């Protein structure tokens, strides 16, 4: 259940980042996505998935 909520935050951030022309605006979404993912994950395996998901958003 905690993983499906983490997939929502990631997939929702993706759509917003992938369709926002402003460079500075996208940085604010991934920053917002970063905080919500770090707060929704406390397990070791969970936090690793958030690490990759945050990494994927930033390289966009």
Numbering used by the authors: 1 to 60
From the paper:
The design of proteins that bind to a specific site on the surface of a target protein using no information other than the three-dimensional structure of the target remains a challenge. Here we describe a general solution to this problem that starts with a broad exploration of the vast space of possible binding modes to a selected region of a protein surface, and then intensifies the search in the vicinity of the most promising binding modes. We demonstrate the broad applicability of this approach through the de novo design of binding proteins to 12 diverse protein targets with different shapes and surface properties. Biophysical characterization shows that the binders, which are all smaller than 65 amino acids, are hyperstable and, following experimental optimization, bind their targets with nanomolar to picomolar affinities.
